[PDB]
Design a protein around this ligand. Sequence first.
Ligand SMILES: *[C@H](N[C@@H](CCSC)C(=O)O)c1c(COP(=O)(O)O)cnc(C)c1O
Ligand code: MET
Lengths: 384, 385, 384, 386
Amino acid sequence: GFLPHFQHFATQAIHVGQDPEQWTSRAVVPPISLSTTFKQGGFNYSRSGNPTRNCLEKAVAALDGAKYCLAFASGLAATVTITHLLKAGDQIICMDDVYGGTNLYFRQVASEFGLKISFVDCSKIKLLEAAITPETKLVWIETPTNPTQKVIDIEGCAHIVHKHGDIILVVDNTFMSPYFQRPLALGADISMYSATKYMNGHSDVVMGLVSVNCESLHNRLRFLQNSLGAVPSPIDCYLCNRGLKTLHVRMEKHFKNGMAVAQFLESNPWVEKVIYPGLPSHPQHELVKRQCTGCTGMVTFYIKGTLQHAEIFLKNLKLFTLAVSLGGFESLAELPAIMTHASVKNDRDVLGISDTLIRLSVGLEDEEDLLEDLDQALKAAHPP
Amino acid sequence: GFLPHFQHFATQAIHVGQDPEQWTSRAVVPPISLSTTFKQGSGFNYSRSGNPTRNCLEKAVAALDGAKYCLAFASGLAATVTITHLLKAGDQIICMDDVYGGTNLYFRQVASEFGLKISFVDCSKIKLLEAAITPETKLVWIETPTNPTQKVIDIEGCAHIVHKHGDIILVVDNTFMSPYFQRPLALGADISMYSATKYMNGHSDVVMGLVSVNCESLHNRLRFLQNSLGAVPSPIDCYLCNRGLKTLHVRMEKHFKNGMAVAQFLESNPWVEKVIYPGLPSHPQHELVKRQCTGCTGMVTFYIKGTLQHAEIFLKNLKLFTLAVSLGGFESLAELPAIMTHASVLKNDRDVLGISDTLIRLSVGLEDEEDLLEDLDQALKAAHP
Amino acid sequence: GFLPHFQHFATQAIHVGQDPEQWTSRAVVPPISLSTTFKQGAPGSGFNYSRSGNPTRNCLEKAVAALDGAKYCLAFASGLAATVTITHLLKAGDQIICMDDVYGGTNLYFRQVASEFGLKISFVDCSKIKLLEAAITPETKLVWIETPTNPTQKVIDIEGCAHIVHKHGDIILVVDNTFMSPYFQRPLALGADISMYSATKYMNGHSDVVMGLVSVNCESLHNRLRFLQNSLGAVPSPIDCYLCNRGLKTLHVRMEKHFKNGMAVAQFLESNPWVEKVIYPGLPSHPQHELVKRQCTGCTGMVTFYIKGTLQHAEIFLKNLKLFTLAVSLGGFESLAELPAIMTHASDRDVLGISDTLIRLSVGLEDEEDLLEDLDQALKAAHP
Amino acid sequence: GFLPHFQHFATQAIHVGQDPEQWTSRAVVPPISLSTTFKQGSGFNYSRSGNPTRNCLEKAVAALDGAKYCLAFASGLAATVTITHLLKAGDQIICMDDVYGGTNLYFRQVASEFGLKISFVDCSKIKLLEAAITPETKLVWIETPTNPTQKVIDIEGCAHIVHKHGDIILVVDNTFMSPYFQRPLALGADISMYSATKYMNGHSDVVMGLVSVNCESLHNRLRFLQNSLGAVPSPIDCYLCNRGLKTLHVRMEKHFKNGMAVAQFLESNPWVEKVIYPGLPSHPQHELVKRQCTGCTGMVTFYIKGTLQHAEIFLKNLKLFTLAVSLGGFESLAELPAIMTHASVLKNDRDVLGISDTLIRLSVGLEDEEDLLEDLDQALKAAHPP
Ligand SMILES: *[C@H](N[C@@H](CCSC)C(=O)O)c1c(COP(=O)(O)O)cnc(C)c1O
Ligand code: MET
């Protein structure tokens, strides 16, 4: 009962921006144009625009259902560039469980330059409307959140935010990818990604992506892409565009493997709790089906016992690799308390990042091998 | 009578950061590590925070600058934006009046929107600079020689004045000279910054910024902002820039020889109004250039005789110089700053700075000297038959 | 009723050769080592020269070997370079038996080049038991077969061929496995001595690497091939090795999609009133369909068919394709179409069945319904 | 008193093949086209047969060789193997007696298995070359200077002798000199061949071969074998090599200056038995070098005094020179050919050629001269303390 799959997604991922008539050679794959500058006697300077990045941006825009897309050197760089749309005296409302890097940037950096940052549980209408002031210019939401996967009603959020006037709604769509969730179709003003994760999907490109429909909002972002210069390499653009060509077949396998991993973990006697949007046990599972076409490979769970049991489990994994990041073809496992949020503690506790919290990025390996790896590692821990 | 060349520069450019013992394979050239993440269970954890190929580049650039530390960024502008994030609302920035257009545009139209106060002053003179310094001043941004009129600033004199007033950061954008010819950190600057897009990489195929620093606390704050703002370069671009660094010494020497020859030809040409080249005795700060530099680059600025259209006729008659923006590559480029690069500086400021309708900026490349002179010769005769 | 899918294929494609412990950084993705040379003889046996061996190529070769069910694999600069290197295993006076309808480049090399250096070349229809064994002489040292053939997709009983060849002693059987990929067919498990690929096609799968691959089990045969890899030097770039190894990580989900799209296209074409004949191994109408099911786990996206009418109708159809792109090569994510008479086999040849109405499709990963519509409207343009 | 430097070399290395008008974007640097195939209707059809980035490189190298055509290959050895496929069973190949070990091994152990007869001749005395030519001779393969003893061959004299015997191809492996210092095609050679892995790319990060030719029929035969045998380079490698070419002139001049200083330091060093450097007056063909070359490279060969023990102590004590094979990069390398790069040459031919236990080959890089001399000084003193 998910939202129907987006039409022409695979076709557009392979063809949009890739027109061979763009090149004198009529190459079916766009060349990698490294050149920093161009003869005048189109393009003038690589930072302002270059063929390989433009092809990628055009492709991503179609996959987001957007008119425009802007590529950046990283997801955080995309976040920083979006925030430069504002001015001193503006207010930002940010979700209380956003990605750690987003939280850190708003709290310790953006707040230094006349921007007021308010962290709100945007799952509650009373708290979001109470936080909106005439100074509110930006609402930053992520869904599902990293790493506890709280889910936000995007269209409900947009309705609340957009009756208050001149407010931009950003959805960090990193966990879902545009194959499973289209925030712009749901009322968001900006669909933002860490392409470092699923979009590229091959664990070899750091990149951010920002898709938009509004004309003035696009021009303001395009100005900051060139003027701040947090631009991606044309080679990274090529590699990310290459990764996009398999996004549909990758994400479907992430869905299949992720669901199987989540169901196996939830029935495992050494697992205390599982958080996976595809499971009926997820508190927002019905909302997930209303606003998504499927689910990703990110599976979050709590192991029974203590930190010692989480450590024994993690150290006995042989296929899941103990590492940060996510969204690649390879399965990863991570303990957020020691690996990402090691500096955070009191905010950990309200957000549930405990000693037994484990986040899995379920990859594309054979399902039976992933389940077996989890099975033997959990038996090694065998907590009470 | 230039400063003696920096000792061991070529040796360090080829070897620093490149130690084969870093790799299990003992590869003589560092591998390109694209991996975004690293197995744990010590060293690296996430590519944006640090990765082998970038760290090798940063170590090499730091040595070339005489620096303890270096940070690589996605572009020169990204390096500028990251440096400016060191400050806070209420701080003042002093910027050189003749600066790269993108630097001027960023400070004037973006940074000023976030509680930062911006003052543009001619930092070649002390009366105007000290009049601009306020208790809120936290950053002084200079370029020398400036882009594009190539005004030269006494770096050590500027640093001494800036460092009397307490906790103020002096950045020298050293893009035009490269660390082979000028070491701002040896002259008292706090930061030596580059658009590595130009000479550092030198091959017109990498957009990148570089920031070298000595102060420990300044490095820790910049390193925090490199990871937290995420304006990081591709590991492949890092490899390509580090590859370009291996020929920086022989490239810059050829830029110097070709640049000097072009400047002398232009200065004796009957169709050239004025030449601005730090290597010529006619440059107003030539003696200062010899005291703070070991040589000069291929950037040649001159004013053509006649009007705006004579400058255009000259530019469109070139057959070896290519009409394009950017600089510092192996290929010779020509450009009219008023309409092409510093078109983002307001017109009133460009007239005060001498960025007129006849000012032309050359990036003299590594081609045969005779071919470059002949291209300039025939193009100038076409503009004035 | 196909062969069961090869176990652990997806897991091995992602993990074999990719061990993070190989690198001091413990990178989860192998770095690209461009270095031509390596420091020797330091205190405390390693690589010495890139052509002889380098980390990125060695990682690729180990991955491909596992995917082929092989002990060893050697990578080359192209599929043809792999073919030429294999032929250098022989000496003047040896005989080569080659299939009468191999890939044109294979045919051209044997006929016009190899025959000039003391090698006797015999072209035999290896689909016939008595024709193959009658051609074998005491001088026969190499039997080269391709299945299915390019482009008419004739299918050869690999195990039957190997059994017949290996009764006669010291003869090498090579199977060019380009059309099927190791995901759908394992010639070494069926008795072949060498499984050879143009990785330019499915193996890389992203139309941006030219490469050959050679997998083998026999120890002496591997040492002889390894000597020729270094001594002839037709080696691939380490960057290309990285790109091909990257493409391997999605081979299973790509090939599964090629199978599903290819089956739908082939089935659609066979019921189309303007198609004379369809040749697709997955269809029951294929003359060796039961044999395909016995020696393969599935089928690829290569669909061969004959259009009704004349050469002009074939041209009108190809001209009207909007999604399929008119170009040579195959095995990429994008759909391609080709008329072998004008494009590849131009320099009768009806004896092999490449007529004016022969069209070869490489069905890509686009949305199935978009591909079927493209074929439908293009076929209606011909014969209106 | 060398030949005058070739006119427009630097200009052409930077501009030939790099015309921005080739690309719709007008990029000043040619894009890297990885695409294996091309949409059909007027140029490319399949990457192995030809692709934009490789074609740009080939045009650039051709101009630098003073040639009409150039063909790029996956390695220097692949270029050698492709050239040899021009022949047929029954043909004879004459090869210089001192060549790169891999060249020697390929002809001796592989090409000889396919009806080709291989003769190793000291072509430095072109009297022995004329005695070796038979009606079956179709290919004469020389290197000058040779790897690693750096014997020098009169290319023009060699070409005159080879070409009066009719239809014989003369190849000069120009790897050690690069086209900046030597143009074999201008001296009568039919083919100028390189391991671009060395000086041409110059950055120790590309394995590649290059083949430049003027003859029309010879080019068509080579172009056919480039496509039909498929030993082609990656378009990315082509881009990297073309990038390296843009500094070839300034690199080679520094190799010349550093190589001369290293060679002079070694020759006056009391612990060095003999130095072989084409730029030194002591080189037996030094005057011939000045008549067919515009300068000299960084390859310096010498014999250390003493025994194998001293050669090992010297090599293990170097701090800047890296003990490794290959050459022509920005970094200085040192190597013992008898055990490392010419261990594949039979021991008997090794002693006859002077590839002994005390023979050391240096690839002098672009580091600061005084640092290079210091490293050699202390390492030689480690083998022979004062
Ligand atoms: C390259 N010779 C190198 C290779 C080292 S192998 C132990 C050396 O150090 O001597 C070379 C070649 C071969 O070209 P490739 O690109 O295939 O390596 C050919 N000709 C000469 C003169 C060489 O030096
Ligand atoms: C530890 S810095 C990188 C964090 C990474 N994006 C993650 O959430 O796993």
